[PDB]
Amino acid sequence: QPEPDMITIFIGTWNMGNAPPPKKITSWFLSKGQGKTRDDSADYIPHDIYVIGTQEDPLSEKEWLEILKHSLQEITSVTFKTVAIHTLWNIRIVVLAKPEHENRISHICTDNVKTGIANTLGNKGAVGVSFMFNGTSLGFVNSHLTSGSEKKLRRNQNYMNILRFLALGDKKLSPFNITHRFTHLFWFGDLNYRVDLPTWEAETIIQKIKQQQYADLLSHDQLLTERREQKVFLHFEEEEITFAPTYRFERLTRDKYAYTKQKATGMKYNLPSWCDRVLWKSYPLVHVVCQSYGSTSDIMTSDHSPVFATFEAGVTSQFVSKNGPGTVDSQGQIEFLRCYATLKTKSQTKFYLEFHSSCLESFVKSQEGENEEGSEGELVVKFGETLPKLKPIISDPEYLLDQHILISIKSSDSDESYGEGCIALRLEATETQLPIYTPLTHHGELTGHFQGEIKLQTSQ
């Protein structure tokens, strides 16, 4: 039985509005309704992995897992295995997988982050799940961010707290937050970003939705605008939105948006908005293709509609040679030439690099770089030809060209990371000097750039 080089992943996000679901929710898992929907011909084909994020979920874990497993059984005739379930207050994530994957899945981690302070600590935050699928690391984040049209800055703060403090994936990757720990990271939930148009325009917005004319609404979506200004979700992807706003509906129909201010809303307007979202970030040059992104039309127990997204995702096999694991492959080597970091920092400490990769026995520390002042005020840290030669555990090109090197640039004085990035080994050529580049981030904000040349030697 061959190991796969591709899997499909279903991502669902649903704010349930503290109501039990209806008897049938299969449309969600089939990616049927509005937007980019799944072909009828695929209906019986199970996804490899289903990841279900709920918010305002009133069910026990037992009650929800029964409903989910029943739904998938009815669609696929497959009894899915529970990989992980984790709940913080009424925020929940469930990961289900085909039984044939049970011995492909390992290193399962769960965590949560509670956002805010005092007044604003008690119901918002995130849950997450990570695991290895053969040689591929997968992370999943379900967040319920701060509500309200006038709190986009609070949402951006909630995002930074979640990516700083959610403890998933390989704890040895100590310089790296969740935005660097995974081959594929999916981040979804009730992110609560709103369409920023005047209150008086509510009926105009409703008209536009009835005409399926979303362009003048999406141009005011706070998540799109904050992402374009690099305020949140830097280096993440989102599929184009082609479905109606998923919030705020009258329950038991989808015919009416309930937007007017009420005592129940704290006298706040809820203009129709794309609150419910799926984003992803994969390592450079790894296959990831969104094959659906939409909302259901027939599940109406909540004031939100469910959102689905599905993906093709490249995966690699648990590689064994005669040498690695448990030793290196003399044939293999990674050389860095003419490398330099450009940092936005005002500090003047010396810096060194750490190279982290599951293709190395353990992480590699460089010598300190040579600081120079850049023309336009910047710090340039030069490494020249001084960087260590990295010795991968396996030299087979079918393995090594699929790997990635995480880079952290750390202060000699404090040993704190000033920037993190990732370099793909999926090169155009081996035994050849080739340009490499990554942006550097810290706490998910841009801090600099790393660039230079690489020379990769494989057994071929």
**Is 171 near ligand WNM (CB under 6 A)?**
no
Q: Closest approach of Cβ 220 to ligand WNM, in Å?
A: 39
CB of 79 or CB of 174, closer to ligand WNM: 79
Q: Closest approach of Cβ 369 to ligand WNM, in Å?
A: 59
Position closest to ligand WNM via CB = 70
CA distance 15 to 17: 6
Query: Considering CB under 6 A, how many residues would be counted as binding ligand WNM?
Result: 4
Q: Closest approach of Cβ 393 to ligand WNM, in Å?
A: 45
Name the residue among 42, 49, 45 with its Cα closest to residue 9.
49
CA atoms within 13 A on the CB side of 351: 27
CA distance 192 to 313: 27
What 8-state DSSP symbol labels residue 234? T
CB of 66 or CB of 373, closer to ligand WNM: 66
CA distance 332 to 320: 15
SS3 447: strand
CB count in 10 Å sphere of residue 231 = 18
**Subset of 411-440 contacting ligand WNM (CB under 6 A):** none
CB of 23 or CB of 263, closer to ligand WNM: 23
CA distance 202 to 15: 22
CB of 70 or CB of 210, closer to ligand WNM: 70
How far CA 44 is from CA of 40, 47, 211, in Å, comes to 9, 9, 33
Q: Closest approach of Cβ 298 to ligand WNM, in Å?
A: 15
Contact 353, 175 (CB under 8 A): no
CB of 73 or CB of 260, closer to ligand WNM: 73
CA distance 33 to 41: 15
CB of 25 or CB of 205, closer to ligand WNM: 25
Q: Closest approach of Cβ 95 to ligand WNM, in Å?
A: 18
CB of 73 or CB of 106, closer to ligand WNM: 73
Contact 191, 143 (CB under 8 A): yes
**Subset of 326-385 contacting ligand WNM (CB under 6 A):** none
CA distance 352 to 350: 7
Q: Closest approach of Cβ 54 to ligand WNM, in Å?
A: 15
CB of 74 or CB of 431, closer to ligand WNM: 74
CB of 23 or CB of 171, closer to ligand WNM: 23
Q: Closest approach of Cβ 112 to ligand WNM, in Å?
A: 25
Task: Among 23, 62, 228, 346, indicate the residue that binds ligand WNM (CB under 6 A).
Answer: 23
CB of 24 or CB of 251, closer to ligand WNM: 24
CA distance 282 to 302: 32
CA distance 347 to 350: 9
Q: Closest approach of Cβ 253 to ligand WNM, in Å?
A: 21
SS3 content of the chain, % helix, strand, coil (to 5): 15, 35, 45
Q: Closest approach of Cβ 22 to ligand WNM, in Å?
A: 9
Evaluated on CA atoms 315, 317, 321, 324, the torsion sign reads positive
DSSP state string for 66-87: HHHHHHHHHHHS---EEEEEEE
Task: Among 70, 107, 251, 261, indicate the residue that binds ligand WNM (CB under 6 A).
Answer: 70
**Subset of 39-68 contacting ligand WNM (CB under 6 A):** 66-67
What 8-state DSSP symbol labels residue 259? -
Name the residue among 62, 131, 65, 74 with its Cα closest to residue 94.
65
Q: Closest approach of Cβ 333 to ligand WNM, in Å?
A: 55
**Subset of 393-412 contacting ligand WNM (CB under 6 A):** none
Burial class (CB in 10 A: 0-12, 13-18, 19+), 391: middle
SS3 155: helix
Q: Closest approach of Cβ 15 to ligand WNM, in Å?
A: 21
CB of 70 or CB of 107, closer to ligand WNM: 70
CA distance 443 to 216: 32
Q: Tokens at residue 326, please?
A: 């448990």
Residues making contact with ligand WNM (CB under 6 A): 23, 66-67, 70
